[PDB]
Amino acid sequence: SVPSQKTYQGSYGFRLGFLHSGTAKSVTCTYSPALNKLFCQLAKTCPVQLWVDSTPPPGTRVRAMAIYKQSQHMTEVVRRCPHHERCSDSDGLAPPQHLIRVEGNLRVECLDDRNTFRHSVVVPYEPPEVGSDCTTIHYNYMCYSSCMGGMNRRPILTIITLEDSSGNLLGRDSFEVRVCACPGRDRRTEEENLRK
Ligand SMILES: [Zn+2]
């Protein structure tokens, strides 16, 4: 079983947005539109924008889940490595196995699927505040892409799903993630490789 990654705006015109953070050596999180790839440092704040054309109903939720990008690894549950799952960096709510956490949201729910064993993290959808045109979720990635016994240098995708109160699909978007020491350099390197 592999979760779908098919982009789907749905009835509410759901899609993600990313800040424009640049590629300075010091940047902690940066997004490449050309690669559809987020580059970030370990456990640092990753703002992800939620855009809609119309407001979805009360009880709508937003779920994040990771899958391996390569087809030969897609059936493997993405989880934290044997070191990081035991490093007692708990935030009180996220299970220590979970790669993706949501920062600063007390209504977070952390799911371990009883059938697929995949991890996900879900929060209620809130419409944009006064003076904002979108809503933002702050994500943290809790292992490096290179962590041995975990992602093990394999690329992952994050799948963001807009769901109704039963968990039915309303919209879907996705992006590749690399968790690394120097996001700014790595984004520049991979974008240069793409041009070449
Ligand atoms: Zn790790």
Residue numbers in the entry: 96 to 291
Authors' text:
The tumor suppressor p53 is inactivated by mutation in about half of all cancer cases. Due to its low intrinsic stability, the human p53 DBD is very susceptible to inactivation by destabilizing mutations, resulting in unfolding, followed by rapid aggregation at body temperature.
Tyr205 is located on β-strand S6 on the edge of the β-sandwich, with its aromatic side chain packing against the L2 loop. Two additional structural water molecules occupy the space created by the large-to-small substitution, which effectively links two narrow water channels that preexist in the wild-type structure on either side of the phenolic group of Tyr205. In the case of the Y205C mutant, we also used a triple mutant variant without the V203A substitution (M133L/N239Y/N268D) because the side chain of residue 203 lines the anticipated pocket created by the Y205C mutation. The Y163C and Y205C mutants in the L2/L3 loop region harboring the zinc-binding site were also significantly stabilized, with maximum ΔTm values of 5.6 and 9.4 °C, respectively. Interestingly, the Y205C mutant was not conformationally rescued in cells, despite a substantial stabilization in our thermal-shift assay, indicating that a certain stability threshold must to be reached, which is more challenging for highly destabilized mutants such as Y205C than for Y163C or Y234C. It has, however, also to be noted that the binding epitope of PAb1620 in wild-type p53 includes Leu206 in the immediate environment of the Y205C mutation site.
